[PDB]
Design a protein around this ligand. Structure first.
Ligand SMILES: [Zn+2]
Ligand SMILES: [Zn+2]
Ligand SMILES: [Zn+2]
Lengths: 56, 259, 259, 259, 56
């Protein structure tokens, strides 16, 4: 009813944060490739300096 | 709505005429020998024995290669050009509103989009279906109404590039950011300083003294057995490049693909 | 309530006229050659052989690029401009009171907001529904009364930018902070010091002595084979930039998106 | 469709005539002694005792080896050449639309493609089936209609290489990037600076003083017991090479194979 | 039907990546020595600077 169910945070890190535009078209690249049943078994390749997932 | 056919004013507005892409030149973006020389105000580069100054040919040469370096340093298309791509069908992205990422970005406009078989158009999508995101390099269809991949089913023709900005201090997503111009300048300047740094003194001189008939002269110089005569300026320019590339690699995003 | 239609005085108050955005200039924000020169009080930049001082053209050029660098260094829009966005439908955020984050911030005002299909307005939301948060760049609707996404359903027109502050020492969320002005100054100053640092002495001189007829002169200088003549000032300016950017990156937030 | 047989205009467009590959020369790519000398403006290389300048023969020699080094530094084919490959059958990739990766890239065009047995063609695939991706080096078939491997079943003839770019600042995927030219230049320049760095002073001199009859001369030089006379320039050129190779190794991809 | 079943990536690393030709004849050395029942219990010796296998 009220909680945060959020599994965790995907931390991507580089010399500077992406602009909001860059991040929203990265969200479009993500959802058009990986969401739902249609994307269900694909794996993204990402070449950021470091990638971490924090379990909450 | 009425429009020049491909250039539906919501999904694919016209930003350049396919005749203007031939008419645009480096000087229209401010990349000119005078622009480089301005950043070396109070310096002149000249042949030490011949006295003749270095010609603008070398400046324009260096500038064209600085643009090439900039276009690989950021995964972008700077000068307008017509791109023709044959793209693979992939089921996930074809199902995702016919998603395709262009190889070159920004998109100035999409020129053609067809599904084909041995060059025969199987279907030509109405231009009112085309959805373009210019800075992202994304094209999609939103229709008005045995294998996961197959080669070269989709034919895509478009113009990639940037237009020179129309206002001071500001750029639209299809217009060049004001300091990518300065980045290309800095890249040119870094080579021109390497040229000039040879000529401030005679070849290989790092100290000199001359004494004649009670007159003495003695010069120490910015050359050394380690550092060349323009080391300092090149280092500073490298700092500026680092800051500029940080900012511009924040403006353009991280590359990604789904496998 | 009565108001100029889009500018409902609670949710979308008018902060600028769409004619004034053409009338505003860099000098209205205090970015002027005189402002740069003030920070180099007691220095003059002049061609060592020709004696002519460096013209204001280069100052304004540098200032425009310093503004561009500042607008990428912080993910912000500084000079007022009209932004037209076509934005994707996403079910989570559309359900979250039609939440959209603008690409450019601050919002000075929202100009139009529509849900559309091939350019046909499907619905035009009453301006009394529009909720704007200017510094955040957030717009929402609070109505008075088969897929999770679809491309370019939402059409949003707005003005992004900052106004020059109306009081000393203070700024509203849509007004420029007093020291972002100083940051753009410092960026200009860092290039002008690179220019001036070439001209304090003849090219490549790092020490000199002259002795003639019992008169001797000898000068050591801030140039060296490592450090250029204005290294120190550039280093200090870099420190000031670091502090300023820390503060301003605390004023503007961290970027985030939900996937 | 009508075309010169192998060069189906969608899948295998003709980019060069097999007579022009003999007519192309290094100078057509801008690799010329004058181009090297331009980057050493204000320097001349000459025999200290004989006075004769260094001949263009050594320049062209160095340039040809700089091209060889560039072709191994990036896993690429630069100058057009006809490649004839006999390729292994592998079941996974033969099932994957007859996928083959060429040893040399880019592909300018495919010349022949056959499945054979002791040199006998078992099948010759229609040229309208051939799908070529030029910069990737990939060829596939899309047919119009007891072991996992066997040796040398597939015969593939093609031209690998790059054409000189047709526009300033721009290249197609089969055209040479503007700064790979500069990379080959820099490689030549690095050897020519090693030659020139021996001749600025007499052999092994790192300081000299001469005093005669009240006249004194004294020279310090960029030579030392550690650093040679052109150490600085070579270091800078190495920096430029590093940046160029970073960019070009982003343009060409990572190598991969499935086992 | 659609997934990546790929067990993992064999990372071999040295001062520079192998050419495509080198890598394809290394694939021939591999398959002629190690594939199927015929190769099933042989172990390759490799003298790369470092070798890693990433489980996916
Ligand atoms: Zn992208
Ligand atoms: Zn935000
Ligand atoms: Zn490859």
């Amino acid at each position: 009813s009220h909680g945060g169910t959020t599994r965790g945070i995907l931390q991507i890190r580089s010399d500077q944060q992406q602009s909001q535009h860059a991040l929203e078209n990265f969200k479009r690249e993500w959802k058009s490739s990986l969401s739902g049943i249609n994307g269900s078994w694909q794996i993204p390749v990402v070449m950021a300096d470091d990638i971490k997932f924090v379990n909450m | 709505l009425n429009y020049e056919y491909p250039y539906h004013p919501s999904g694919n507005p016209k930003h350049i005429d396919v005749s203007e892409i031939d008419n645009l030149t480096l000087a229209d973006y401010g990349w000119s020998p005078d622009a480089v020389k301005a950043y070396m105000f109070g310096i002149v580069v000249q042949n030490p024995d011949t006295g003749q100054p270095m010609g603008d040919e070398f400046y324009n040469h260096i500038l064209e290669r600085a643009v090439g370096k900039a276009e690989r340093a950021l995964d972008i298309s700077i000068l307008p050009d017509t791109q023709h791509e044959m793209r693979d069908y992939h089921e996930t992205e074809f199902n995702s509103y016919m998603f395709v990422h262009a190889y070159r970005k920004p998109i100035l406009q999409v020129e053609n989009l067809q599904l084909q078989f041995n060059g025969r158009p199987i279907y030509k999508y109405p231009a009112n279906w085309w959805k373009v995101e210019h800075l992202a390099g994304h094209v999609q269809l939103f229709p008005t109404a045995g294998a996961t991949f197959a080669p070269q089913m989709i034919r895509l023709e478009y113009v990639s590039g940037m237009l020179p900005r129309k206002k001071a201090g500001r750029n639209k997503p299809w217009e060049m950011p004001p300091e990518l111009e300065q980045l290309v300048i800095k890249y040119a300047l870094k080579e021109i300083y390497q040229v000039w740094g040879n000529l401030i003194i005679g070849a290989g001189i790092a100290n000199k003294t001359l004494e004649v008939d009670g007159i003495t002269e003695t010069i120490g110089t910015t050359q050394s057995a380690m550092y060349g005569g323009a080391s300092a300026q090149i280092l500073q320019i490298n700092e500026d490049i680092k800051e500029l590339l940080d900012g511009l690699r924040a403006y353009f995003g991280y590359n990604m693909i789904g496998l």
